[PDB]
Amino acid sequence: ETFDPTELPELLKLYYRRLFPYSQYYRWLNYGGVIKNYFQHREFSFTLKDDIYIRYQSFNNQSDLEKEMQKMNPYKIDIGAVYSHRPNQHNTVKLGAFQAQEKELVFDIDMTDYDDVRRCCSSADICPKCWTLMTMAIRIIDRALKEDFGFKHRLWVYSGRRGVHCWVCDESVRKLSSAVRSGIVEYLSLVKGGQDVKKKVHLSEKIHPFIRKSINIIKKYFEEYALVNQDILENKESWDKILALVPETIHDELQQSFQKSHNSLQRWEHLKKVASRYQNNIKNDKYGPWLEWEIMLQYCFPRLDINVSKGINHLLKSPFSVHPKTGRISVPIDLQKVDQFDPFTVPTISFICRELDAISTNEEEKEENEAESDVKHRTRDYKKTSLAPYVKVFEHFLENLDKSRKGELLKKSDLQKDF
Amino acid sequence: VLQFAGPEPMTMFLWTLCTSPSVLRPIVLSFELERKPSKIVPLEPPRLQRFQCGELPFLTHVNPRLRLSCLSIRES
Amino acid sequence: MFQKLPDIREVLTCKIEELGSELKEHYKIEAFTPLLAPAQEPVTLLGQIGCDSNGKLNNKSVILE
Amino acid sequence: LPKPGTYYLPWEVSAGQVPDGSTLRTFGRLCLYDMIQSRVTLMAQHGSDQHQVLVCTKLVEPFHAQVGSLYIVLGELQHQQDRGSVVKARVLTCVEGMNLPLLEQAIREQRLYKQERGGSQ
Amino acid sequence: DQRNASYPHCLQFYLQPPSENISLIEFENLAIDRVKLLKSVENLGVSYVKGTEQYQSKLESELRKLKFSYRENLEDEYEPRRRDHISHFILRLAYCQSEELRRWFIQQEMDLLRFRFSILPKDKIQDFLKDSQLQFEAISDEEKTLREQEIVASSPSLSGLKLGFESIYKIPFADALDLFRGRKVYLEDGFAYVPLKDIVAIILNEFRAKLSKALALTARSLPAVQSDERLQPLLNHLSHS
Amino acid sequence: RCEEETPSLLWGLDPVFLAFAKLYIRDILDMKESRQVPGVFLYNGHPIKQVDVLGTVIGVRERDAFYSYGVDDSTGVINCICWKKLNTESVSAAPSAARELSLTSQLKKLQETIEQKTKIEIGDTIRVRGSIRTYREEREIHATTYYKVDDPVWNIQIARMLELPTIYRKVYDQPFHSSAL
Secondary structure (H helix, E strand, O other), X not given: OOOOHHHHHHHHHHHHHHHOOHHHHHHHOXXXXXXXXXXXXXXXXXXXXXXXXXXXXXXXXXXXXXXXXHHHOOOEOEEEEEEOOOHHHOOOOOOOOOOEEEOOEEEEEOHHHOOOOOOOOOOOOOOOOOHHHHHHHHHXXXXXXXXXXXXXXXXXXXXXOOOEEEEEOOOOXXXXXXXXHHXXXXXXXXXXXXXXXXXXXXXXXXXOHHHHHHHHHHHHHHHHHHHHHHOOOOOHHHHHHHHHHOOHHHHHHHHHHHHHOOOHHHHHHHHHHHHHHHHOOOOOOOOOOOHHHHHHHHHHOOOOOHHHHHOOOOOEEOOOOEOOOOOEEOOEEOOOOOOOOOHHHOOEHHHHHHHHHHHHHHHHHHOOOOOOOHHHHHHHHHHHOOOHHHHHHHHHHHHHHHHHHHHHHHXXXXXXXXX | OOOOOOOOHHHHHHHHHHHOXXXXXXXXXXXXXXXXXXXXXXXXXXXXXXXXXXXXXXXXXXXXXXXXXXXXXEOO | OOOOHHHHHHHHHHHHHHHHHHHHHHHOOOOXXXXXXXXXXXXXXXXXXXXXXXXXXXXXOEEEO | OOOOOEEOOXXXXXXOXXXXXXEXXXXXXXXXXEOOOOXXXXXXXXXXXEEEXXXXXXXXXXXXXXXXXXXXXXXXXXXOOOOOEEEEEEEEEEOOOOOHHHHHHHHHHHXXXXXXXXXXX | OHHHHHOOOOOOOOOOOOOOOOOHHHHHHHHHHHHHHHHHHHHHHHHOOOOOOHHHHHHHHHHHHOOOOOOOOOOXXXXXXXXXXXXXXXXXXXXXXXXXXXXXXXXXXXXXXXXXXXXXXXXXXXXXXXXXXXXXXXXXXXXXXXXXXXXXXXXXXXXXOOOOOOOOEEEEOOOOHHHHHOOOOEEEOOEEEEOHHHHHHHHHHHHHHHHHHHHHHHHHOOHHHOOOOOOHHHHHXXXXX | OOOOOOOOOXXXXXXXXXXXXXXXXXXXXXXXXXXXXXXXXXXXOEEEOEEEEEEEEEEEEEOOOEEEEEEEOOOOEEEEEEEOOOOOOOOOOOOOOHHHHHHHHHHHHHHHHHHHHOOOOOOOEEEEEXXXXXXXXXXXXXXXXXXXXXXXXXXXXXXXXXXXXXXXXXXXXXXXXXXXX
């Protein structure tokens, strides 16, 4: 169905009144109350109707937050860092004593960093062929953050249109300074260079284990995504632009081989054979012995933004928001079934509102004479709609966080040797 | 002679002094009523003016002002 | 050849306080009323005898500090 | 806008007669300044007994601390698990030579007038 | 033997503050000498490339001229070490106003400590590490052979199966930032495995930077009490000389 | 019975109308606005038009045209807008005679004294005089004159706190004016 933006306010009001998961939100944003005044210092920033931007917002408890969202009905919601004072009273403190302290490490990935590599879509469009890029990016980043670094709790959130966010919400991660975050981002980058540079990957003779494992992960998806669907060797211009990253001494040979070749698979095999033959004649040459791996890295590796993670007072879109243009929901992504995740199947606000209307109509004859509180009504409303599995995933992540907190408390008690 | 209200470096200095917070200060005043007790002439009826607070002028009955005379002025 | 007023003030205060505490402990007194606190009942005060003028002490110009 | 800072005598704050989160303004004499943790301890002598007030000064540094001088602290009271109660100072001004009995008399007069005015409702 | 106990090593972490009484003239001279040494170190670092021979020779000449402690002699090194200690503390007091000054001071101090560490003998390195509060952990030979290929592939200044006759250290990933930044160390489940030379150099530099930053932040709360009529012209002149 | 307000024609007869009333900040926030004329409030029948407050600054906010302050009087917190006076057409100094040069130097000294007197930060003590206004469902004082009180011993605030109840009892808690007896 085609979304009509003129119907947005009513669906937004109904969604913020009945379906938004305030309880799970407050459970996540409080972290068990181990530290006094943690949620009271979290900074929000809403965008009202007709492009009104207000930041430095904070709330006292769950009920106040519910009332504020119900009254204002914001189009966008963002989460900031924890400060040393209540953000809404930031002028009652001597200047220089109001600084950000803690914020969960975040990541950002977007389509707009692949417009020069992909050809299936145009500009800012997505098709089931190009989502394999985000699948590979998710797998690479998750494996790196789980094995190389050792970050336990991770949340992957569909941005709504074209991207996926990563909320790393461990205990020691939140206290990291900006320098360590910049170091991490620099450690997790290979595609480096400006627009004017054609070859953006340079691999040395010695291969780092991280790069080797990323390459091993890429190889399982490269064939079907590139040669079959993308068809990056179909026309003259395709292999012409591919030829910009190969040694200059084999341009004519590769062109003749590609003219002899018929399909993309044959051209790829010919390129592999040519590179293997040339690797035996490499003697102090600019081009490394890994042309094929360099091409794969340039055409498949994810590109992160350093500005989003370097700052400690940055803002990002919160989970369970509403995209003002398409009208989807920033639904959490399950890692165990990342292959089956279909972006076009994400429920829209209009569809879930229609489902809520049908549920109410059924309840007019199925659930009658019940004087339940509004909390239970909203719980049933979001349980019976299409949003149930996503809140289930959120609950599983919250359970993991609670188990980690309980284990840390038990370890602290063991250290104190008091029970 | 300066008439700030009512029907040159020296002038500028006096004008600046007469409006600065160095003059408009709390004081302790020992005053004497200007109209001597012997004098007798009660003939004043209330007037009518047009104070305007909220961009909405209104009319009120106002009493004549109190006239005093100074005898001593001290700070505080 | 180096003196500062807070040091002298501290020395004088320490001397007065120590001597007053010893006297109170010996004489079994309950409490010392502050100098500036007015009351209608007899009170016990502690202080140092001084003169308000630069001249010699007399029975009409004694101030308790 | 922050909550107003009502007056409270030190022997009322130290006796736990103030609920959590209330904004209070008290007074006392400085004794210590632990620069490592930014903590200040004040006592006020009532009769023959000494009561203590702890003030966390993380929002007023840098600071010039004089030992033995009266201070007035305005902030919010917070109850802690082991450190008892600590006042998070917002404004900490130095006053020396204040006539304390006059201040207490004024405080009691203000409280009495407030009670009298509230007695008609 | 208070003399050698106070200053046993040329290298220091500047933990103990001085406790003796000195005249004003020596105070001013020490401050000026150390600020000149810092500026000379910065200029030498910018002009040349760190390392080489001319750079280190000029740095040694500059250190010798300003009667400071750079070498290791068994006789009469109390005075240079004492001057270095007192001058560094005075400069720390004078350089704790703004972020830019703190960053510049930390940079220069790190460079000077790196040079002084680079000119030290091996057993002296071990003794200096023991003297300070740092304690390191060395992995066993079984672990070393269990992860040889990954360490050699990372190549932290190791080429051609040079893992033998080396001790691999295990450190948290938040302390190896210099090597961790540009893929020069092998990371596994939150720990970094570093050979001896890189671990001592980089980890000592990073720990010194963190400690100096924390202590300068602590000393920032002090000058609110520096209302002394003396030392005020000196501090003002040195702030924006 | 709903107490009918005093007629708008007899308001000027009250002496309190033209005088800067000393009131608690809690009272300032609690008085009921008069229906006859907005901007003029009532307290026990007294038509109050201007106020006078003294307190501790707890927050400073600055815009392009006005300042903002929060005055705390140990009873409540209210805002105090302080407008910015435009310094257009500044007086040009000239190398006149010696007496005129001394006059210009004294004028510069007075200007510096005024600028020092009007400088306010967090934690100081401020005295604000002006008229009450309502803006976006918020009650605030549009200051006419204001300056920083130099109070190093806490005598002025003690005197104010001791004096306010007496003035309340003897003036404000009284029935009304005398309009044709």
